[model samples]
Each structure stands twice: as structure tokens, then as C-alpha cells.
Target: FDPRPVETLNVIIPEKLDSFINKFAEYTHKKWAFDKIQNNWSYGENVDEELKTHPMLRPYKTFSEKDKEIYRWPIKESLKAMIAWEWTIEKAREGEEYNPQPPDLSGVTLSRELQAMAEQLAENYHNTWGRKKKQELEAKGGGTHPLLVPYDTLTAKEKARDREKAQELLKFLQMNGYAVTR
Candidate 1:
């Protein structure tokens, strides 16, 4: 039930964090898909039990309800902080001296709620874009379009062009108030 058009949607995550998220998502999915499969068996072992013992998942299982709640606050807060950090970094890269101060959302409950909504919307936008991009690439004739080239296979100029496009899209999101940088 998203009301916004796909072209108008925007998502802004720090380049480093975005890279990490992609890697982690791939790692997790691959592990679940094949890594934990039982030897010479048709089906995998119990996912819940495997997850309970997993290095990453074990820590999550150990969290008490209160501990989980406490950690959740910072995750929500970090989304705002990350946007500020991204803006500051972008300005610095452009030779502008900019140091962002955190916005005061103390008495503004609605602002916090809206920030959460923005994060969800941005995540959805990213997922939708990725799926469509993959589909488009697969549909290309003989799958040899420069635009569809793998990241590592792209030339330096092509890589730079891709970065420029991403930055332009982030700027558009910022202009539309979808980004929450201070």
C-alpha cells in the first residue's frame, strides 16, 4: 500500500554501513541456504537450534526483554545520527567545513515516530529497487549492458558515474525531507 512512486523514493545509508549490510545479508542468507545443511541429508537441521548456537544469533538470544528494549532505542537513534554523519562526510568531501549538531527531538514524539516511518519507507524502497534492478538486468538482451555490469567489472569512469548517480539520488531524498540529516 505504498503511495509514493518508485522513481520518487529515496534511501540514505552511510556507504560503509550500506556495504556492511549487503555483505551481512548475503552471508546470512547463504549460510541459511547451504552452510548448515546436514551431511548426506535431503533437508537441513532445525533452524531455530542452529540459530541459537550461531555466533551472531546467540548474542541476540541472550538479550533479555529489557536489554532488547534498551538496545532498540539506540538503533532508532542511530538512524538519525547516521544521516547527520553522512551529510557531514559529504560536505567535508566537497571541501566544505560542516559539523552537524544533533537535532532536539526531546519533546517531539511525533518527530520520532515520523523518523521511524521514514526508516521503514527507505528500507522498503531499497528492497523494491534492488529486486527491480535485478529483474531489469536479467531481462537485458544477452545480459551484456554496461549499466548491468557487475560492480567489480565496471571501469573507473563507470564506477564514478554510479557513485555520482547515488549521490544525486540522496540529494533528491534530502530535498524531499525523506532524509533526516541535521
Candidate 2:
């Protein structure tokens, strides 16, 4: 059996919504979608209608059948990275650090159960990633401390301080097979 739901819902935002990213359509659209979902923003009772009519919501479409059958979750690459993060954190939380495979998603018998499990995994992974991102962003000299700071704009002094602090923090995470750069 498939062991999962047949469909999942996701929103898409239009690139032109932000004047700053006029050239990079995909990037802007993805960024807008991420921000919207991360914040849990709602558009009243007519959310579907509102979204459908939204000028910036034009870029996103439902996941294709091929994606559903093969890709698992097909909205963004960050989805996979976020899933790996969850699998990593769950290991640490359970006092098991170096498991090559965390939770087994293959060979399940029931499609519904698998679908539910997959959705749960994706949701939890994204939430955890967001929380960690916020924590890192808020930490002292985290560069994105202000949440709106453009990375390329960091001053030399600020960059140096951030680099040192980042290295110290990353050294701790390095034991878990993840580096600071990623």
C-alpha cells in the first residue's frame, strides 16, 4: 500500500509581490511562500478565493502526480534538508547519535498510515527547522540577528565577530555530521 494520503495542500506566492526581487522569479516566489507558511498567516474565510486571485500567488501549483509518487514531498529542496534535520534531532533527543537510517518510511503496508506519517514528518521537520533558524538568528552576532539584515551587507568587523562565534557554535554541531557552512 502507499501508506500515505493522496494529496497535501501548499500555497504559492507570486514573485512580483516584492519589488526588490523582480529578476529572480522563483526565488522571490519561494521566499514569499516560506514567509507566509512560517508565519501562519490567514486570509479570512475565503482563503482559497483570496489565494487564487492573489497576483503573487501565481507561481505555485499543486504537486504533480509524478512528484507525489516518487519525490515524496515536492514543494522545495528545503523540505528534504528539513526532514534530515528532524531525523538528526530525533536521534540526539533519544540519545542515539549515529544511526545511518533514522525512521524507516519504506516497506509500509498501509497507504493511509504512511501518508499520515509522511505529512507528520514533513510538518514537524519544517517546524523544528524554523525554530532552530529563529534561535540562530536571534543569538548574539548571528548576523541575521535583526531578521532583516542582508548577508552581503555585513561590515568587516561584524563579519569577523560573527565568523569566530559561528565557528565555536559549529564545532559543537560538527560532531553530529553537519558543518557550520550548511
Candidate 3:
């Protein structure tokens, strides 16, 4: 892949991380599928370990919503822990920045649970949108669509859009002459 000014989020300030989560989901599915195929797993209408067949042994892109949700569960957990610590991810760089300063999550605050609440709502919207899309895609044979996976597993595009939306929210708030401090 080529390099870019935009960083690859290991986690998100928003959409960037969302993008990584999608790729992470792809990687997660592929890892399992690769192992399954390697050990003689193949597609079958009826899942049979003895028959060495599974319906989801095919491409990640073709998987149904049901098959994709599990991957998101782990990602959500990762998000909570990282956010709790106020972790910030620097994009992968040619020559990475080197600094000795400690990270900023050191200070205590009132429950940072508000961030978690917003995250949950955002995720809810994403999953609902995916399900709606997938229901239609179900009839088109195998395919991949934007918003096809859960929020935690959303592709970079969705994450970027969400990040931009986040900005819009902050910008609107600023327009009212109210300021937010971190």
C-alpha cells in the first residue's frame, strides 16, 4: 500500500479508527477462514465438523450480518479499555515521532462514561444501517456493501464520515459560542 498524510488508526479519534476496525475485522475473519480452509474446511449448507464444511468458510465480503457480529464484540471491548486510558494512536510513519512524555489519561475526571454512551449510540446506528442494507443485499447473491458490518467493524469510510460528523457537532456547538475543554 502507498503512504499518506492520513495516519492508520490502531484505534480512533473517530472514523480513522473505525476504518482500522473494518480492516481488523477482515483480518480477523481471514485468519479464521484461512485456518479452516487449511485444515480441509469447505462450504456446506449444513455445518458439519465431521464433514469438514462450514457455510462461512468463503470470503469475508460474502459473509452475512449474523456471521460478522462476533468479530465486533472483541473490537468494542478493545475500544472501551483503550478509551478508558485515553490512549491516542499516532499513525504509522516512515520515521516515527519519538517523545518521552507520558500519555494524557493520567488525570482523573468525573465518569468518562459519557464517551462510552455516545459510542454505544453511534454503534447502534451503524449496526441498524448495516442490517437494513444487508437485508436488501441478501437477494443480490454474494456481495459486500458499505455499512455491511457492525460499528466496531465498520470500514474506514464509515469511520471517516463519523469523524467528520463529530466535527460538525463540535463546530455547531462552537457556532453557538459555547466551548468544550478536554
- Considering every candidate listed, which one attains the maximal lDDT? 3
Expressed as tens digits, the lDDT of each residue in 40-73 for candidate 1 is 2122233356343332222333446564444333
Ranking by TM-score: 3, 1, 2
The C-alpha local distance difference test score for the whole of candidate 2 amounts to: 0.34
lDDT string for model 3 (10-122, tens) is 53445555555555565557767777777878889889979998877766667776677677555544454345445444343331101112212223222344344435435
Clashes of each: 0, 11, 2
Instruction: List TM-scores for all candidates, in order.
Output: 0.21, 0.20, 0.43
Candidate 1 deviation (Cα RMSD): 16.8
Relative to the true structure, candidate 3 reaches a TM of 0.43
For model 3, the run of ten residues with the poorest summed lDDT? 95-104
Give the 10-residue window scoring lowest on summed lDDT in candidate 1.
94-103
Q: Name the lDDT value of residue 103 in candidate 1.
A: 24
Error of 3 at 113 (Å): 26
Candidate 1 local Cα displacement, residue 145, angstroms:
2.2
